[PDB]
């Protein structure tokens, strides 16, 4: 009921194959970030470019995501018997070097480019947040135990 490494690589592969620009972010893109698996992981997350946001999400459903949670332009949850979860977000990479997100109660999230980068997780070079960004996005008050467990992996490690 896990998301397995190989089912990652998988859904990295879709999006490369698309075309479709995007970076590996959440839980997954903690572990990359260390070089090698840590934990089993519920889901993924992937921040990608939402002028391919229709062909994305028919793709997904193509090979059996169901969509649970729709809160787009934001964010949806889709769900996968055998992959399991998928969190997939919308970003917009602006002319002004900006890359924004769609805030759900009105208005933009304002993102630094640097934030999104690569790492090499053995022998693949792998589209993902930063671990400073990593770091931006958790709320140093309100973290769970996995959370502290991976921001703990993020010191540890790297």
């Known amino acids: 009921n896990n998301v397995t490494e190989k089912e990652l690589f998988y859904i990295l592969d879709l999006f490369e194959h698309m075309k479709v620009t995007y970076w590996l972010d959440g839980g997954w893109g903690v572990d990359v970030l260390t070089g090698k698996q840590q934990r089993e992981h519920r889901d993924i997350d992937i921040d990608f470019d939402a002028q ?3 062909k994305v999400i028919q ?5 059996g995501y169901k969509i649970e949670v729709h809160w787009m332009p934001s964010r949806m949850e889709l769900k996968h018997e055998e992959y399991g979860y998928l969190d997939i977000h ?4 602006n002319d002004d070097g900006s890359i924004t997100q769609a805030n759900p109660e009105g208005g933009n999230y304002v993102f630094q480019n640097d934030w999104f980068s ?7 070079k ?4 930063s671990k400073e960004a990593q770091l931006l ?3 140093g008050y309100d973290l ?5 467990f991976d921001i703990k992996n993020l010191k540890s490690i790297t």
């Not at 792998?126 to 947040?129: G, S």
């Open 118 to 124: 690569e790492t090499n997780y053995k022998d693949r």
């Open 52 to 54: 391919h946001t229709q």
């Open 90 to 93: 919308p970003i917009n990479l």
């Open 144 to 148: 769970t135990e996995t959370d502290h």
């Open 137 to 139: 996005f958790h709320s």
């Open 126 to 129: 792998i589209p993902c947040i």
């Open 59 to 63: 793709k997904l459903e193509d090979i």
